[PDB]
Structures are given as structure tokens and as C-alpha cells.
Amino acid sequence: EFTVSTTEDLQRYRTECVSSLNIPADYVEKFKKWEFPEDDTTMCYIKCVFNKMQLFDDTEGPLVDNLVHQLAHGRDAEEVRTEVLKCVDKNTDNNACHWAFRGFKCFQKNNLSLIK
């Protein structure tokens, strides 16, 4: 049973991902200011966060219904689903880090935030 992540849930997941991926201090300061370089360090960090939020599976990819519940923030569920589906694609370059990051960049482009 999926449940929406709070701001506190997300802060914890980011902390856990920084620790478990041994993310260097300079990347943590970039992420804090919503700067996400297009390197494997950043891409695997985003995958880790999305994994913990149950928004992404390394084999199945983006978890569409879970994403709609998380990202809607009081918007129309059908409108948000249409937006999410436009950002959902196949694992064409066989890389779950690249895959999760691509979706994230698409969500950002379309002003879909994890927290309002």
C-alpha cells in the first residue's frame, strides 16, 4: 500500500542516500540549492531518492499511479496523470540511474515538485 511522502520523509531519504552512496560534500551543497549535474553521482542519487519514495523501480521504471498521488499537490488527478505519462519512457539505454534522472528532468520541466 503506497502512501504519499511528507517533507520529513523526503529529508530523511536524501540523508540516507547521501550516506549510502557516499555523496561528496560539494554535491550535497549543489543538491541543497537544487543544482543537479548530469553525471552518474547525481543520477544514482536521484534514483536512490525515487526508490525510497516508491516512485521508481529499477526494472519496471516510473511507478505512474504513485507519482500521480505524490506530485498532484491539489491539482486534477487526470491532468497530473497525463503530464506524468508524457515523462514515462522505456529503459532505452539500459541504465536505471540514467532512467530515473530522465524522468526527474521531465517532471522539473513541467513544474511537478515532490513537495508543494
Query: CB under 5 A: which stretch of 22-30, 44-52, 61-69, 87-95 binds Cl ion?
Result: 44-52
Q: Judged by CB, which is closer to Cl ion: 78, or 110?
A: 110
To Cl ion, the closest distance from the beta carbon of 13 in angstroms equals 8
List CB contacts of 114: < 8 A, sequence separation 6 or more.
5, 10, 53, 55, 70, 71
DSSP 94: S
3-state secondary structure of 36: coil
CA 35 to chain centre: 14
To Cl ion, the closest distance from the beta carbon of 49 in angstroms equals 5
Q: Judged by CB, which is closer to Cl ion: 80, or 103?
A: 103
Q: Which residues are annotated as a binding site for (9Z,12Z)-octadecadienoate?
A: 14, 45
